Design a protein around this ligand. Structure first.
Ligand SMILES: Nc1ncnc2c1ncn2[C@H]1O[C@H](CSCC[C@H](N)C(=O)O)[C@@H](O)[C@H]1O
Ligand SMILES: Nc1ncnc2c1ncn2[C@H]1O[C@H](CSCC[C@H](N)C(=O)O)[C@@H](O)[C@H]1O
Lengths: 276, 276
């Protein structure tokens, strides 16, 4: 949450850009444990309703227990978002890091749109891995030493061509929304930038490091052979998978609590309106 | 201007993030024709003073004529920003796409800081070419086809190692500011995303295309031989310079008025405070 979005910036989107003043009925697809709800409900007009959809039974159990303690009206539906049939029309349909797992993104977006009432809105929070990866700066190390953008670029394109899952879908949402007839389409990059400051000595700096590691940043690549073979099987040559391995190994050994790291997740927020 | 920043987002930074309520005395280094002033003065408290510094005589002539028609108190000083000696202390020292042209960024930043009064602020608007380049999506084309991130990554790192000019300095400002003792350092990514919509048929869509081209997006690479030799001389191999050429040629031929393009300049806005 606090690693991808600034609290003040999300409030900016809600109150200034989207100008939401009246309570809204929102549906969140692939809500997980209700992340997007924990982010937006506090900023939405009092009286707003939050409905999350997810197939993970355990996830919904955590979500329910989590929102049980909150003063927000929230409900969670268990079911396959690609087949679930809703009976109501919502003011806003949203999702966070959901569409990138869909083999047929456009279709799922189509379904989300159909669940929105005329004059309603659709907001998608999706990542753009390639811009995310290019948004790294490690003091004392050349980016190309621990991040092979060229290899990553080919790798993410290959995976998408295979199963269909698009890790860079965040920048394509505007186009999918356009083809689907959505109006007033606009995309925005979360303004969030994380800065692990080597000269900041405070508990907050230590907490940021913990969050970074819990997110898997600069994780151990593991067994070299399994790694190279795993990548080669995804559409990469041997010299590419190797360069990638040595790159990840370098990052694993270079990053530590005392380091200076600047990172902008580059999350993509696309929204548009449903033709009245 | 409108290609790199959203009007509402800049106002957000001024009023909500920086919370500037009292009129401020700001100095802009390498102001060019006064771009940053045309952007911030309208949003700053009435009574604010704008002072720009630049070595380009013609540039300052245009700036003066441009601000002559405006209701903002503005003055332009002609001189080398790396040697100019100011007699006053400013509330805020700023710059836009200036530090990337400095061979010794840290030193110039040091000078900017010295021109700021205790309790004052320093705001730097600098680019991050690599994240800018990775932030491209062209419908109907694979990013790796018209943009070689791997080559660009090596290329920009090489240039920096040579003359010292850093095209990716935007993400390093926080670190330079940290070493210089600046407090409350925070970086933000402009939330701007340009979307040339193939399904939008309106004069605004045509204007966006014009702006994109005037900025040099997808420009003709020119003579193949001169191009490859030019890059090789900058620290790249032959197979890299060639891949780069064919990449730029593809973009030049693929992008047109009817295309769907999504682009997030990824400008980096770093700011901090001078200890008082
Ligand atoms: N057909 C489907 N229906 C519902 N959920 C699905 C799905 N296919 C994949 N998912 C899932 O989609 C979610 C996306 S990952 C987590 C998303 C959540 N909004 C967050 O940002 O934390 C997972 O929790 C997982 O259960
Ligand atoms: N030592 C120096 N003193 C003043 N200007 C300098 C300089 N070294 C380079 N420059 C310049 O720095 C500027 C940076 S490019 C333009 C910056 C302007 N803020 C804009 O965004 O439009 C140029 O106008 C050029 O004149």
């Amino acid at each position: 949450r606090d690693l991808y979005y600034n609290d003040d910036y999300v409030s900016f989107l809600v109150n200034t850009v989207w100008k939401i003043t009246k309570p809204v009925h929102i549906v969140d697809y692939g809500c997980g444990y209700g992340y997007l709800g924990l982010v937006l409900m506090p900023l939405l007009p009092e009286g707003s309703k939050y409905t999350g959809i997810d197939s993970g039974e355990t996830l919904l159990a955590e979500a329910r227990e989590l929102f049980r303690l909150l003063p927000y009206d929230s409900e969670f539906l268990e079911g396959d978002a690609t087949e679930i049939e809703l009976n109501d029309k919502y003011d806003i349909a949203i999702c966070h890091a959901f569409l990138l797992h869909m083999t047929t993104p456009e279709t799922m977006l189509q379904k989300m749109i159909h669940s929105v009432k005329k004059g309603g809105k659709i907001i998608c929070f999706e990542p753009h891995w390639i811009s995310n990866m290019a948004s790294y700066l490690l003091d004392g190390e050349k980016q190309s030493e621990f991040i092979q953008l060229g290899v990553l670029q080919k790798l993410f394109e290959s995976d998408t061509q295979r199963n269909g899952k698009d890790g860079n879908i965040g920048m394509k949402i505007p186009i999918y929304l356009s083809e689907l007839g959505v109006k007033n389409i606009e995309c925005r990059v979360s303004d969030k930038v994380n800065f692990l400051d080597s000269n900041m000595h405070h508990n907050d700096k230590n907490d940021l490091y913990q969050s970074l590691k819990e997110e898997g940043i600069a994780g151990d690549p593991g067994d070299k052979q399994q790694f190279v073979e795993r990548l080669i099987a995804r559409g990469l040559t041997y010299d590419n998978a190797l360069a990638q391995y040595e790159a990840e190994l370098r990052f694993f050994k270079a990053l530590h609590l005392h380091s200076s790291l600047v990172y902008a997740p580059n999350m993509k927020i696309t929204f548009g309106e449903i033709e009245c």
